[PDB]
Design a protein around this motif. Structure first.
Motif, PDB file in Angstrom:
ATOM      1  N   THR A 172       9.940  -4.220  -1.164  1.00  0.00           N
ATOM      2  CA  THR A 172       8.816  -3.551  -0.523  1.00  0.00           C
ATOM      3  C   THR A 172       7.871  -4.625   0.012  1.00  0.00           C
ATOM      4  O   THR A 172       7.408  -5.483  -0.735  1.00  0.00           O
ATOM      5  CB  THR A 172       8.093  -2.624  -1.506  1.00  0.00           C
ATOM      6  OG1 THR A 172       9.059  -1.781  -2.129  1.00  0.00           O
ATOM      7  CG2 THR A 172       7.061  -1.747  -0.790  1.00  0.00           C
ATOM      8  N   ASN A 173       7.629  -4.593   1.317  1.00  0.00           N
ATOM      9  CA  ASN A 173       6.755  -5.574   1.957  1.00  0.00           C
ATOM     10  C   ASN A 173       5.294  -5.460   1.544  1.00  0.00           C
ATOM     11  O   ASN A 173       4.836  -4.408   1.078  1.00  0.00           O
ATOM     12  CB  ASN A 173       6.812  -5.427   3.476  1.00  0.00           C
ATOM     13  CG  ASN A 173       8.058  -6.020   4.066  1.00  0.00           C
ATOM     14  OD1 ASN A 173       8.725  -6.851   3.447  1.00  0.00           O
ATOM     15  ND2 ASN A 173       8.390  -5.586   5.267  1.00  0.00           N
ATOM     16  N   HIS A 175       1.631  -4.786   1.219  1.00  0.00           N
ATOM     17  CA  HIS A 175       0.761  -3.713   1.651  1.00  0.00           C
ATOM     18  C   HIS A 175      -0.299  -3.494   0.567  1.00  0.00           C
ATOM     19  O   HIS A 175      -0.308  -4.191  -0.450  1.00  0.00           O
ATOM     20  CB  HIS A 175       1.566  -2.438   1.827  1.00  0.00           C
ATOM     21  CG  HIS A 175       2.040  -1.869   0.530  1.00  0.00           C
ATOM     22  ND1 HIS A 175       2.942  -2.526  -0.281  1.00  0.00           N
ATOM     23  CD2 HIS A 175       1.698  -0.737  -0.124  1.00  0.00           C
ATOM     24  CE1 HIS A 175       3.158  -1.806  -1.365  1.00  0.00           C
ATOM     25  NE2 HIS A 175       2.413  -0.717  -1.295  1.00  0.00           N
ATOM     26  N   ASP A 177      -2.502  -0.047  -1.518  1.00  0.00           N
ATOM     27  CA  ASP A 177      -2.644   1.400  -1.681  1.00  0.00           C
ATOM     28  C   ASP A 177      -4.109   1.751  -1.887  1.00  0.00           C
ATOM     29  O   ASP A 177      -4.934   0.896  -2.229  1.00  0.00           O
ATOM     30  CB  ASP A 177      -1.759   1.937  -2.823  1.00  0.00           C
ATOM     31  CG  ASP A 177      -0.271   1.862  -2.490  1.00  0.00           C
ATOM     32  OD1 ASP A 177       0.227   2.689  -1.703  1.00  0.00           O
ATOM     33  OD2 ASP A 177       0.405   0.972  -3.012  1.00  0.00           O
ATOM     34  N   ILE A 259      -1.475  -6.134   7.087  1.00  0.00           N
ATOM     35  CA  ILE A 259      -1.208  -5.532   5.786  1.00  0.00           C
ATOM     36  C   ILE A 259      -0.812  -4.056   5.950  1.00  0.00           C
ATOM     37  O   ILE A 259       0.174  -3.596   5.368  1.00  0.00           O
ATOM     38  CB  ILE A 259      -2.416  -5.700   4.842  1.00  0.00           C
ATOM     39  CG1 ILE A 259      -2.657  -7.195   4.589  1.00  0.00           C
ATOM     40  CG2 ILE A 259      -2.189  -4.963   3.527  1.00  0.00           C
ATOM     41  CD1 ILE A 259      -3.834  -7.505   3.693  1.00  0.00           C
ATOM     42  N   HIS A 260      -1.576  -3.332   6.759  1.00  0.00           N
ATOM     43  CA  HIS A 260      -1.244  -1.954   7.128  1.00  0.00           C
ATOM     44  C   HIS A 260       0.094  -1.854   7.878  1.00  0.00           C
ATOM     45  O   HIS A 260       0.775  -0.837   7.774  1.00  0.00           O
ATOM     46  CB  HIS A 260      -2.380  -1.357   7.978  1.00  0.00           C
ATOM     47  CG  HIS A 260      -2.118   0.038   8.461  1.00  0.00           C
ATOM     48  ND1 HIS A 260      -1.390   0.306   9.602  1.00  0.00           N
ATOM     49  CD2 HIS A 260      -2.504   1.240   7.971  1.00  0.00           C
ATOM     50  CE1 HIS A 260      -1.324   1.614   9.784  1.00  0.00           C
ATOM     51  NE2 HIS A 260      -1.993   2.203   8.809  1.00  0.00           N
ATOM     52  N   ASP A 261       0.463  -2.893   8.635  1.00  0.00           N
ATOM     53  CA  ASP A 261       1.741  -2.900   9.365  1.00  0.00           C
ATOM     54  C   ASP A 261       2.935  -2.998   8.410  1.00  0.00           C
ATOM     55  O   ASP A 261       4.048  -2.609   8.764  1.00  0.00           O
ATOM     56  CB  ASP A 261       1.794  -4.039  10.400  1.00  0.00           C
ATOM     57  N   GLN A 262       2.696  -3.528   7.208  1.00  0.00           N
ATOM     58  CA  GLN A 262       3.709  -3.627   6.150  1.00  0.00           C
ATOM     59  C   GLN A 262       5.006  -4.285   6.632  1.00  0.00           C
ATOM     60  O   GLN A 262       6.110  -3.863   6.278  1.00  0.00           O
ATOM     61  CB  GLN A 262       3.979  -2.248   5.537  1.00  0.00           C
ATOM     62  CG  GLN A 262       4.702  -2.320   4.199  1.00  0.00           C
ATOM     63  CD  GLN A 262       4.653  -1.033   3.400  1.00  0.00           C
ATOM     64  OE1 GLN A 262       3.934  -0.084   3.743  1.00  0.00           O
ATOM     65  NE2 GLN A 262       5.422  -0.997   2.312  1.00  0.00           N
ATOM     66  N   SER A 263       4.852  -5.332   7.439  1.00  0.00           N
ATOM     67  CA  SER A 263       5.978  -6.030   8.046  1.00  0.00           C
ATOM     68  C   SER A 263       6.203  -7.417   7.449  1.00  0.00           C
ATOM     69  O   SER A 263       7.177  -8.081   7.796  1.00  0.00           O
ATOM     70  CB  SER A 263       5.752  -6.155   9.555  1.00  0.00           C
ATOM     71  OG  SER A 263       4.528  -6.810   9.832  1.00  0.00           O
ATOM     72  N   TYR A 265       6.616 -10.245   4.239  1.00  0.00           N
ATOM     73  CA  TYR A 265       6.865 -10.673   2.871  1.00  0.00           C
ATOM     74  C   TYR A 265       6.442 -12.139   2.735  1.00  0.00           C
ATOM     75  O   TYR A 265       6.982 -12.999   3.419  1.00  0.00           O
ATOM     76  CB  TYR A 265       8.348 -10.551   2.503  1.00  0.00           C
ATOM     77  CG  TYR A 265       8.605 -10.894   1.046  1.00  0.00           C
ATOM     78  CD1 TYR A 265       8.287  -9.992   0.035  1.00  0.00           C
ATOM     79  CD2 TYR A 265       9.114 -12.133   0.675  1.00  0.00           C
ATOM     80  CE1 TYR A 265       8.490 -10.310  -1.300  1.00  0.00           C
ATOM     81  CE2 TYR A 265       9.325 -12.457  -0.658  1.00  0.00           C
ATOM     82  CZ  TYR A 265       9.008 -11.537  -1.641  1.00  0.00           C
ATOM     83  OH  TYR A 265       9.210 -11.844  -2.966  1.00  0.00           O
ATOM     84  N   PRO A 300      -3.732  -6.087  -2.436  1.00  0.00           N
ATOM     85  CA  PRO A 300      -2.470  -6.191  -1.701  1.00  0.00           C
ATOM     86  C   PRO A 300      -1.325  -6.646  -2.590  1.00  0.00           C
ATOM     87  O   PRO A 300      -1.520  -7.483  -3.474  1.00  0.00           O
ATOM     88  CB  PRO A 300      -2.757  -7.266  -0.644  1.00  0.00           C
ATOM     89  CG  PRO A 300      -4.233  -7.338  -0.541  1.00  0.00           C
ATOM     90  CD  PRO A 300      -4.736  -7.034  -1.919  1.00  0.00           C
ATOM     91  N   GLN A 302       3.315  -7.014  -2.896  1.00  0.00           N
ATOM     92  CA  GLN A 302       4.686  -6.960  -2.416  1.00  0.00           C
ATOM     93  C   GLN A 302       5.633  -7.000  -3.618  1.00  0.00           C
ATOM     94  O   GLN A 302       5.301  -7.575  -4.669  1.00  0.00           O
ATOM     95  CB  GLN A 302       4.974  -8.145  -1.482  1.00  0.00           C
ATOM     96  CG  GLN A 302       4.807  -9.516  -2.132  1.00  0.00           C
ATOM     97  CD  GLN A 302       5.010 -10.680  -1.152  1.00  0.00           C
ATOM     98  OE1 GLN A 302       4.817 -10.530   0.051  1.00  0.00           O
ATOM     99  NE2 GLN A 302       5.379 -11.845  -1.675  1.00  0.00           N
TER     100      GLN A 302
END
Ligand SMILES: O=C(O)CNC(=O)C(=O)O
Ligand SMILES: [Cl-]
Ligand SMILES: [Mn+2]
Length: 332
Positions: A172-173, A175, A177, A259-263, A265, A300, A302
């Motif tokens: 999971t990249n 991000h 919550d 961070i919102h783009d979650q792209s 690592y 944040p 990962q």
């Protein structure tokens, strides 16, 4: 109260999940925005409920999409048993064009808010044994989740990524919550069909910056490592956005949110860089069988599965972070 410290004294590790005095120690770390680890949660659960075989037997006929963790490709309209049958048995894994078994993640399962409805006995088993129950339980007295008006359980199931090439890929990249959560490792599956992978697992945590005491849990404790986490303080999120805007522009970029783009690592390259260039040091955390990871709202993070993992997370809203949760809800 039985506890110790990991990450060179910077991460609290609570050893008894049902100790009533846990909150006293927890709260001091938590109010400073630190994640917290609680070990031993598996010893409280009903094991037989958290087996991949049981999930396959009971829900295998359901339709689902999967994700190839290595290339992000989606596998559309497959069956639930396809995932669970290959969780530990490598030769049963769905294969890419080249006939090789894929490292897969089960997407959006159970879907929606169906966990409680679809899995009532698992729901009760998790909720009856969550650590810090006054914070974590849906009706716990320090959980504001249901007590606030309309302005504030999920599974993470995926195979492991063990190769050297794999080390720069996230399960999971990175991000964040919007609410507090606790993520519990309820099952770790050691796959068969390619021989032992212990040394690759160890080189992966070492390169992930894990500490010597964390590694003794393997060497001395012989615990089963599930996943490698990197978590950062909520406050440090902009400093991390700044780094990633720049790095992204070094391959063609907008004043947007990485961070919102979650792209992304953060590999060992960027983590040294983030530290020396922005001062930002996170928590490198190896989550073993039975470890519950408390992730502050907006912190944040990962995840990189080492072996095959069954994780179940519960969201909540603590008083200590209720301002964060409010501010994160509006921005998101
Ligand atoms: O376990 C994973 O792959 C990711 N987990 C989380 O992002 C979480 O608990 O918030
Ligand atoms: Cl509590
Ligand atoms: Mn998360």
């Amino acid at each position: 109260t039985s506890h110790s410290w990991l990450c060179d004294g910077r991460l609290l590790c609570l050893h008894d999940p049902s100790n009533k005095n846990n909150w006293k120690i927890f709260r001091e770390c938590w109010k400073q925005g630190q994640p917290v680890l609680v070990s031993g949660v598996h010893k409280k659960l009903k094991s037989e409920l958290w087996k991949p075989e049981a999930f396959s037997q009971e829900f295998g006929d359901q339709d689902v999409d999967l994700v190839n963790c290595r290339n992000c490709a989606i596998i559309s309209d497959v069956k639930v048993r396809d995932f669970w049958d290959g969780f530990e048995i490598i030769c049963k894994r769905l294969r890419s064009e080249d006939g090789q078994p894929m490292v897969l993640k089960l997407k959006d399962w159970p879907p929606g808010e169906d966990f409680r409805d679809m899995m009532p006995t698992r729901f009760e088993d998790l909720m009856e044994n969550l650590p810090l129950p006054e914070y974590t339980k849906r009706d716990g007295r320090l959980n504001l989740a249901s007590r606030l008006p309309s302005y504030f359980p999920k599974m993470y199931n995926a195979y492991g990524l063990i190769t050297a090439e794999d080390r720069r890929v996230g399960t999971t990249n990175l991000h964040l919550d919007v609410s507090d959560a606790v993520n519990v490792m309820v099952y770790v599956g050691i796959p068969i069909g390619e021989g032992a992978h212990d040394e690759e697992v160890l080189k992966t945590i070492d390169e992930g910056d894990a500490d010597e005491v964390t590694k003794q849990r393997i060497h001395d404790g012989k615990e089963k490592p599930g996943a490698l986490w990197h978590i950062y303080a909520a406050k440090d999120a902009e400093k991390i956005r700044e780094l990633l805007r720049k790095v992204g522009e070094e391959q063609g970029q907008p004043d947007h949110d990485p961070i919102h783009d979650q792209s992304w690592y953060l590999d060992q390259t960027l983590r040294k860089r983030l530290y020396e260039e922005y001062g930002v040091q996170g928590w490198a955390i190896v989550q073993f069988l039975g470890d519950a990871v408390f992730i502050p709202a907006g912190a944040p993070h990962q995840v990189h599965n080492l072996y095959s993992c069954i994780k179940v997370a519960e969201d909540f809203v603590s008083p200590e972070h209720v301002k964060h949760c409010f501010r994160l809800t509006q921005e998101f």
